[PDB]
Amino acid sequence: MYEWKLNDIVDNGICAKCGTCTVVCPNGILTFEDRPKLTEECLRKGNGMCFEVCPRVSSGKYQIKIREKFKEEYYYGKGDVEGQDGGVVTTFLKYLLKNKKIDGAIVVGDECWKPVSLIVQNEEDLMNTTKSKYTVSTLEALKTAGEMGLEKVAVVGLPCQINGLRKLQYFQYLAKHDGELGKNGKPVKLPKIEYLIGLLCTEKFEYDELKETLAKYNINMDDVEKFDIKKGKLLVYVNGEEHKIPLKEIELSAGCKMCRDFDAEMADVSVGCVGSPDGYSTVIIRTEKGEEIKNAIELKEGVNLEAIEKLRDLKLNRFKKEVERRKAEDEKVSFYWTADYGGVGKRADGTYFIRIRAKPAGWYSIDEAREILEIAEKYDGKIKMTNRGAFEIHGISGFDVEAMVLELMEKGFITGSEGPLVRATLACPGEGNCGSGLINTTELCKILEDNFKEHPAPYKFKIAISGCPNKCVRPQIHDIGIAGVKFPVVNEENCNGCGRCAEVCKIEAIDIRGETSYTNYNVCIGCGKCIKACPNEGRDVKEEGFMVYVGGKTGREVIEGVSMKLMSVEEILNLIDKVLIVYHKYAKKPQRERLAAVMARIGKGKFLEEVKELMEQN
Amino acid sequence: FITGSEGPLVRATLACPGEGNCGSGLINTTELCKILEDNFKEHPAPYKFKIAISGCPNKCVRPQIHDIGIAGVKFPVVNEENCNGCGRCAEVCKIEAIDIRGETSYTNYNVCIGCGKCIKACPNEGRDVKEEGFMVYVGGKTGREVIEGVSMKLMSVEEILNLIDKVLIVYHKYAKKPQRERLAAVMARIGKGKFLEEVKELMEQN
Amino acid sequence: FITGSEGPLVRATLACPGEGNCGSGLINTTELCKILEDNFKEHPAPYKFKIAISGCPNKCVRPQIHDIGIAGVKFPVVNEENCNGCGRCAEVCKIEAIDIRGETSYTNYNVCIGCGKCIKACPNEGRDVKEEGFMVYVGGKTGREVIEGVSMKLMSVEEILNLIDKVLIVYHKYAKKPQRERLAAVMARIGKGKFLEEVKELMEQN
Amino acid sequence: MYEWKLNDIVDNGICAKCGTCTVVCPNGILTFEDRPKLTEECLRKGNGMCFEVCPRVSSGKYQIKIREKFKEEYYYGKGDVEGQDGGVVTTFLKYLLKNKKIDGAIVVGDECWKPVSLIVQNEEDLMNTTKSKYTVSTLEALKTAGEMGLEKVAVVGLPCQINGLRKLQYFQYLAKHDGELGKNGKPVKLPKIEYLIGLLCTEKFE
Ligand code: SRM
Ligand code: SRM
Ligand code: SRM
Ligand SMILES: Cc1cc2nc3c(=O)[nH]c(=O)nc-3n(C[C@H](O)[C@H](O)[C@H](O)COP(=O)(O)OP(=O)(O)OC[C@H]3O[C@@H](n4cnc5c(N)ncnc54)[C@H](O)[C@@H]3O)c2cc1C
Ligand SMILES: Cc1cc2nc3c(=O)[nH]c(=O)nc-3n(C[C@H](O)[C@H](O)[C@H](O)COP(=O)(O)OP(=O)(O)OC[C@H]3O[C@@H](n4cnc5c(N)ncnc54)[C@H](O)[C@@H]3O)c2cc1C
Ligand code: SF4
Ligand code: SF4
Ligand code: SF4
Ligand code: SF4
Ligand code: SF4
Ligand code: SF4
Ligand code: SF4
Ligand code: SF4
Ligand code: SF4
Ligand code: SF4
Ligand code: SF4
Ligand code: SF4
Ligand code: SF4
Ligand code: SF4
Ligand code: SF4
Ligand SMILES: [Cl-]
Ligand SMILES: [Cl-]
Ligand SMILES: [Cl-]
Ligand SMILES: [Cl-]
Ligand SMILES: [Cl-]
Ligand SMILES: [Li+]
Ligand SMILES: [S]
Ligand SMILES: [S]
Ligand SMILES: [S]
């Protein structure tokens, strides 16, 4: 009926039926019935925020996870309400409402097992939403919460819903622009999602399919008191009886076959039954927001982690079997999980490139280079050497990306230097390799990489380290630049005006006069060459070390960083850490505002003064 | 294998993956790089001489600060009959050159860098090509000093070959300090307009 | 009295006292300013258009960031038979372009800006005139942005009048936003080399 | 009454009743009856192109005249049709139509001495517009010509109308921006005003 880009996901059985896309539309022309659908013509043909938040187009997982910095602490517990298992989810939501942490909760109730998305603002309304509904649910109450103007909500969701809503939270980083403007010039109205409470999930069903399946076992769904999925069985409690149906005999919603995420790995806290005794819920705490559940539930340790891990593996194997089937039948596949990994980019022709983060100063062992070539050959890749000294492998099929990246990681290689984060530090050969080198660039590069590699930033962030003021790797137009320097001072007792030093100074900073020489320090760049060329011990070291620049860049615009001063390695590490903090503080446009643009916007002195203050608190 | 790219001569030409490889690529950077290498590799110059070719205005290989720089460009012009003000193109323009107004859109050509992104993103055939080709810069460098080359104009491959040949001749004519004076230094010394005028004259005799 | 120097037109030309008034002056700034005013005062342009004339490279009236800039210059060349390496000239060169060596001296022409002071300070007729005249810059501004104009070359007063006339014509031709696009913005938009090439072609038809 | 800034001119007896303001509105919410009138709410409260073309707010005459570079040659004559005086205006308009110099003429007819602004495209319709109508006239047919898509017109106007239409021609120089965009994101549709034929005038009556 209407042209809509996501029809590619929905019409080919890849859609998770999570409901994320239908809550973000600023024109309100999307609704979720049995699937996402347009209620009228979209002038963009679906080229917009719906498509951009869809977790089955692209997971966004790597860029989200490096920001959330997930932990993984395993507990089990029970609350004080009768729930599906322990009543933990509802008890936690009651605690968050009581303590004014949220204005409401987005939860799933039911009308005779037909799920309904609800915005609940009080304990009484929350009590109708306990228990699992094992059929397609939506997130539509998020739109209602936004119409009501609620500031903050918690959302309970299946893994696919958690993944969509993490893309919503991180939209500016993943889509690289602000939320889509509607016809009236304004973005969609939605509450802030303050807590993401995830459910473990192996599958959900279409309501009609479940009801028909039950009818085959002479069960009237309308009469069921409770459903459960335990140990490969659908449990059905009706008329005071427990009925078991093997899950193998029930058709799952088609999109669950394309699913990889069992335990809602991106949630603040994930809750399930696997791994914990009956009557308790398993609780996997991953973030500081999730850590607040400790205040709501008396938690215990002793989870059966292997029971959880086996379901992770079973779900992954199901996904792999379905992808292989689609490959064999030439059916549509959306390679949404390529974004689980750093260093993966999509080429113009729909295959991918994999960037191996450049090693310090571009040194590679022969064995290392041979290993890269062997992996490239195995996957039909083509070698491209980048201008930061990285191997980049081109032409990789979406079907091979994950396997190849994992093989590279097993051999010890890090894929990365892509996306809004600290890119591979670029250093020259430096002292003891290049005859002009004044500092150990390789080791400083290794130190900077060890401390900051792949650390997130509002936009790409690039560091360069040159061994001398020739600045071959261009530190004076990098976000942070370091250049080795060694300034001379003439020794009056020894210099005899022989004249040799002036000959090696290409910038002509030396004045040979009578029986002596001078240095013009308004021109001298501290290359140290005159000190090394003098045969008469006529030039001593005035000052030497690591010269530092902050706030430069190339690309669309050339900006020279602000010259700072000579700094020690400890000071440089402090500086980089605090620059990243102040950049985060003031950046307003992820994936658009480089550090130099933030400094320009707020004032170079103001930005540098705040960095110095944080450094001194360190 | 050819050992080289050292000393006072035309160094290895630096090109990105370009069109058909990078999703942003607008020109065949590899083939143009091969052409420039075939014509000028290891040709002597008063000092090191570096050429760069970027596939689009993101300029990853920094052509705007090379002795000679080329950047692929593709400028848009809105088709008033098709554009409906949907708003999608403005979302892909990171430098915010696009004005969405009512049922149409506009381009601010004092900001637009000709990346072509809006043309590719439009779902309604609302943006056509205004102008496209190889944008050329002359007289930049990095190293001890950062100098942005003089923006020239769009040029054909044949014109670029003529230009590079003539730049090298005029550089040799006016350079006085081999191994110290880059092209940018010679242009600064004698006047950028004087230098480029003489290059143009030699190109026309060609 | 003429009321003016306001709106989108050629504003009052700004000149320093120059030769015979300022001790550093090398050219007759008052007369050149009078000539430019007589030829172009209040002439329309797409946006304000400002000319400055400095008497020497100190550039007190800032010709290097004006729409058209002129600076008087006088470059030295050492008279090898007369220079005795006394050292006086180096003392008056604030930019330190002079190398005193043994019984002679040298000038670093990658630094010398042609102020002529060494010629005047030498007591031994050791420095003669290498080159002198009106150095010209095109396409600078201050205000909301700082832009340095493109260095051209030394020009005659006859050539400068031709240049200004043709710059104004090419500026009109390519300007799209009256009262918003300065000359520098038009040059940036279409390419500095492209703009200056068109100017030269019109100058040659004159 | 709908808020409209040009009410400061109309309500204080300064309005010339030329009609210029009511032809430029890109939303078509201005009409001219006995005076300029808003037919619905203006979101800008009249802060826009109507006010910016009004010759009684600011003449713009200096910036216009330095561009038009008016001469002043005096003649008298008669055409070949019966007019007010010599029939010169109608004859000239008949010549411009016949030689395809314009697609139509904006002229003032009458219904029993009530003036009516007309867009005429042939000699037959032009002949009903001879003679002076000494009461308030408008320029409203410019809007019709714009709706019809006519490329070029001639306009006959009283001095105040000529002054307003010169501001329209020079809008970007005087208002310092492009023509106002309507709610649909597009500017007003008007023909290019290729000829402005002014009438001498000491007064008009209600
Ligand atoms: C591979 C590489 C070019 C090369 O030929 O070597 C590259 C490749 C891309 N760059 Fe870059 N950039 C690469 C170095 C650069 C550099 C130079 C550097 O980093 O030393 C710059 C300018 C220096 C700087 O940024 O300070 C650079 C400035 C950009 C920009 C403009 C950024 C800006 O702030 O102006 C973009 C576009 C954007 O980010 O919007 C971009 C975007 C890209 C993308 C990801 C665009 C795309 O996919 O549509 C390109 C991937 C194509 C591919 O096949 O890999 N690339 N890019 C370089 C990889 C370096 C590495 O190993 O990590
Ligand atoms: C290998 C390399 C650095 C790297 O880590 O990758 C390099 C290495 C040297 N550079 Fe460079 N330059 C290298 C790229 C650069 C660049 C970047 C570029 O070319 O894209 C620049 C600045 C960009 C530019 O020049 O426009 C650069 C600016 C210099 C300069 C200063 C030139 C100037 O005009 O300011 C010198 C010293 C000199 O020429 O006096 C220099 C001198 C040198 C010498 C030959 C100095 C020496 O031997 O004492 C270094 C050789 C050391 C070695 O181990 O190879 N190198 N050098 C780069 C080789 C590129 C290639 O494959 O051909
Ligand atoms: C009087 C003066 C300032 C002063 O204290 O001396 C001046 C006064 C105004 N300038 Fe200016 N500008 C004056 C020299 C400058 C200069 C310096 C120069 O011309 O040497 C510049 C920057 C140099 C340049 O333009 O290259 C300058 C850049 C501007 C700008 C920004 C232009 C730009 O392209 O960025 C504006 C605003 C605009 O044009 O939009 C402006 C606008 C104005 C206006 C007309 C704005 C207004 O009326 O709202 C000011 C009139 C106020 C008044 O009381 O006169 N004025 N203005 C200067 C008169 C010079 C003369 O005698 O002709
Ligand atoms: C379709 C589905 C499949 C599941 N599969 C597994 C599994 O394989 N293994 C496992 O360990 N656990 C699974 N669970 C989770 C488990 O059944 C319990 O829901 C979980 O342990 C929480 O129990 P509780 O007593 O603490 O929560 P309660 O206090 O009972 O609260 C239950 C919460 O679940 C939410 N909810 C219920 N149905 C839906 C739905 N369809 N979509 C979104 N939210 C919903 C409600 O909004 C409510 O907040 C699944 C749940 C669902 C809905
Ligand atoms: C209100 C008014 C006052 C005038 N006062 C003087 C005066 O003081 N001194 C003087 O020398 N001449 C004045 N004239 C001009 C003069 O009356 C003749 O119109 C002029 O000489 C042209 O005559 P014509 O035979 O060549 O033109 P014609 O061929 O007769 O054509 C006359 C043209 O006048 C236009 N026209 C008529 N009435 C109006 C109007 N109200 N508004 C705009 N356009 C109109 C018609 O469109 C037509 O094209 C005045 C005209 C008007 C309308
Ligand atoms: S208006 Fe935007 S969010 Fe809505 S369906 Fe269209 S592209 Fe999607
Ligand atoms: S996976 Fe979710 S966000 Fe994507 S099309 Fe389906 S319901 Fe929409
Ligand atoms: S298996 Fe669960 S988390 Fe996955 S698509 Fe299905 S309902 Fe969503
Ligand atoms: S920056 Fe200096 S030490 Fe490093 S490769 Fe270049 S010349 Fe050698
Ligand atoms: S510093 Fe050394 S090389 Fe230089 S003039 Fe003195 S003695 Fe000679
Ligand atoms: S340290 Fe280098 S730049 Fe400085 S005087 Fe010595 S040779 Fe010259
Ligand atoms: S310059 Fe453009 S085409 Fe080339 S790699 Fe960069 S983003 Fe791609
Ligand atoms: S050019 Fe295309 S993407 Fe942009 S507003 Fe117009 S129809 Fe939409
Ligand atoms: S071509 Fe690029 S810079 Fe220009 S308007 Fe389009 S997206 Fe923006
Ligand atoms: S620019 Fe030179 S001649 Fe003019 S006042 Fe200044 S120092 Fe004197
Ligand atoms: S040029 Fe003159 S002032 Fe300079 S060292 Fe020679 S004799 Fe002395
Ligand atoms: S002309 Fe001036 S800048 Fe040049 S060497 Fe003489 S005193 Fe120095
Ligand atoms: S919409 Fe604009 S032109 Fe029309 S009355 Fe309003 S301000 Fe005036
Ligand atoms: S444009 Fe003319 S009719 Fe309108 S307010 Fe001004 S003088 Fe009056
Ligand atoms: S005297 Fe004539 S030109 Fe003046 S306002 Fe009246 S009608 Fe217009
Ligand atoms: Cl998912
Ligand atoms: Cl970040
Ligand atoms: Cl040579
Ligand atoms: Cl003009
Ligand atoms: Cl008037
Ligand atoms: Li010396
Ligand atoms: S990049
Ligand atoms: S180099
Ligand atoms: S000004």
XYZ file of N, CA and C in Angstrom, chain D residues 75-146:
216
model
N 12.465 65.325 -24.950
C 11.858 65.345 -26.269
C 10.352 65.535 -26.118
N 9.669 65.726 -27.247
C 8.214 65.621 -27.281
C 7.832 64.956 -28.596
N 6.640 64.373 -28.622
C 6.188 63.733 -29.844
C 4.770 63.227 -29.699
N 4.284 62.614 -30.779
C 2.981 61.964 -30.753
C 3.064 60.611 -31.450
N 2.237 59.681 -30.980
C 2.119 58.361 -31.562
C 1.041 58.334 -32.620
N 0.515 57.137 -32.880
C -0.476 56.946 -33.932
C -1.843 56.525 -33.395
N -2.101 56.742 -32.108
C -3.397 56.454 -31.514
C -3.838 57.674 -30.716
N -5.152 57.765 -30.497
C -5.726 58.868 -29.734
C -5.520 58.623 -28.244
N -4.683 59.440 -27.615
C -4.466 59.288 -26.190
C -4.834 60.508 -25.371
N -4.327 60.549 -24.136
C -4.502 61.731 -23.298
C -3.916 62.957 -23.978
N -2.641 62.845 -24.339
C -1.903 63.961 -24.973
C -1.499 63.508 -26.377
N -0.278 63.006 -26.535
C 0.162 62.517 -27.832
C -0.063 61.044 -28.109
N -0.598 60.287 -27.154
C -0.709 58.853 -27.329
C 0.634 58.159 -27.343
N 1.641 58.758 -26.707
C 2.989 58.205 -26.764
C 3.074 56.922 -25.948
N 2.444 56.889 -24.769
C 2.590 55.712 -23.913
C 1.986 54.490 -24.593
N 0.737 54.610 -25.043
C 0.092 53.479 -25.702
C 0.859 53.070 -26.958
N 1.328 54.041 -27.747
C 2.070 53.683 -28.956
C 3.349 52.931 -28.613
N 4.096 53.408 -27.617
C 5.292 52.690 -27.183
C 4.944 51.270 -26.747
N 3.872 51.115 -25.969
C 3.502 49.788 -25.488
C 3.114 48.880 -26.648
N 2.508 49.480 -27.678
C 2.112 48.734 -28.901
C 3.382 48.264 -29.625
N 4.449 49.074 -29.583
C 5.713 48.719 -30.226
C 6.425 47.613 -29.461
N 6.414 47.679 -28.127
C 7.100 46.663 -27.332
C 6.413 45.306 -27.449
N 5.077 45.293 -27.498
C 4.362 44.039 -27.717
C 4.659 43.480 -29.104
N 4.578 44.327 -30.130
C 4.751 43.842 -31.499
C 6.143 43.255 -31.717
N 7.160 43.841 -31.095
C 8.531 43.381 -31.251
C 8.940 42.383 -30.177
N 7.953 41.835 -29.465
C 8.180 40.770 -28.447
C 9.218 41.178 -27.391
N 9.310 42.470 -27.071
C 10.166 42.914 -25.980
C 9.522 42.678 -24.615
N 8.197 42.495 -24.570
C 7.475 42.174 -23.345
C 6.396 41.164 -23.717
N 5.934 40.427 -22.713
C 4.811 39.504 -22.859
C 3.471 40.147 -22.532
N 3.492 41.301 -21.877
C 2.276 42.004 -21.526
C 2.631 43.334 -20.902
N 1.611 44.175 -20.775
C 1.755 45.489 -20.173
C 0.779 45.622 -19.012
N 1.271 46.186 -17.913
C 0.450 46.505 -16.753
C -0.009 47.951 -16.913
N -1.315 48.144 -17.085
C -1.879 49.423 -17.494
C -3.189 49.637 -16.749
N -3.658 50.881 -16.746
C -4.856 51.264 -16.001
C -5.969 51.538 -17.004
N -7.006 50.701 -16.962
C -8.257 50.968 -17.633
C -9.265 51.568 -16.669
N -10.521 51.570 -17.095
C -11.576 52.105 -16.245
C -12.933 51.537 -16.617
N -13.779 51.439 -15.597
C -15.214 51.172 -15.755
C -15.895 52.448 -15.289
N -16.352 53.242 -16.251
C -16.973 54.556 -15.992
C -16.166 55.336 -14.940
N -14.867 55.490 -15.214
C -13.878 56.295 -14.483
C -13.443 55.683 -13.150
N -13.936 54.510 -12.770
C -13.351 53.750 -11.667
C -12.140 53.006 -12.224
N -10.918 53.349 -11.809
C -9.736 52.727 -12.434
C -9.667 51.229 -12.160
N -9.079 50.510 -13.116
C -8.901 49.036 -12.991
C -7.520 48.667 -13.538
N -6.714 48.007 -12.712
C -5.384 47.566 -13.122
C -5.546 46.347 -14.019
N -4.928 46.384 -15.195
C -5.127 45.351 -16.201
C -3.780 44.828 -16.679
N -3.736 43.540 -17.005
C -2.606 42.952 -17.725
C -3.097 42.685 -19.143
N -2.532 43.405 -20.106
C -2.949 43.328 -21.502
C -1.841 42.665 -22.304
N -2.233 41.784 -23.225
C -1.277 41.019 -24.015
C -1.417 41.230 -25.519
N -2.352 42.073 -25.962
C -2.572 42.338 -27.378
C -2.983 43.795 -27.550
N -2.871 44.287 -28.787
C -3.191 45.704 -29.108
C -4.659 46.020 -28.796
N -5.568 45.084 -29.078
C -6.997 45.322 -28.863
C -7.280 45.698 -27.418
N -6.782 44.900 -26.462
C -7.052 45.179 -25.054
C -6.320 46.432 -24.581
N -5.196 46.768 -25.223
C -4.437 47.955 -24.837
C -5.196 49.240 -25.134
N -6.010 49.260 -26.194
C -6.661 50.499 -26.613
C -7.710 50.984 -25.613
N -8.214 50.106 -24.745
C -9.158 50.522 -23.710
C -8.482 51.177 -22.513
N -7.172 51.401 -22.570
C -6.419 51.928 -21.438
C -5.833 53.305 -21.713
N -6.183 53.928 -22.836
C -5.700 55.275 -23.086
C -6.384 56.251 -22.130
N -5.793 57.445 -22.030
C -6.320 58.586 -21.281
C -5.948 58.484 -19.810
N -5.867 59.629 -19.147
C -5.517 59.672 -17.735
C -6.761 59.473 -16.880
N -6.620 58.640 -15.847
C -7.615 58.474 -14.790
C -7.027 59.145 -13.552
N -7.606 60.282 -13.147
C -6.996 61.126 -12.124
C -7.403 60.733 -10.703
N -7.717 59.461 -10.477
C -8.048 58.979 -9.144
C -7.185 57.767 -8.807
N -7.311 57.305 -7.557
C -6.399 56.300 -7.030
C -6.412 55.069 -7.923
N -5.218 54.590 -8.268
C -5.013 53.390 -9.068
C -4.175 52.388 -8.284
N -4.188 51.143 -8.733
C -3.384 50.107 -8.107
C -2.451 49.485 -9.138
N -1.701 48.482 -8.683
C -0.820 47.687 -9.530
C -1.219 46.215 -9.501
N -2.480 45.935 -9.163
C -2.881 44.579 -8.787
C -2.697 43.578 -9.924
N -2.779 44.027 -11.182
C -2.609 43.110 -12.308
C -1.210 42.490 -12.371
N -0.212 43.060 -11.690
C 1.073 42.365 -11.606
C 0.899 40.975 -11.001
N 0.004 40.844 -10.016
C -0.221 39.535 -9.406
C -0.823 38.564 -10.412
N -1.808 39.026 -11.188
C -2.404 38.179 -12.218
C -1.355 37.740 -13.231
N -0.540 38.690 -13.709
C 0.540 38.350 -14.633
C 1.452 37.286 -14.037
N 1.748 37.394 -12.746
C 2.543 36.363 -12.098
C 1.848 35.019 -12.078
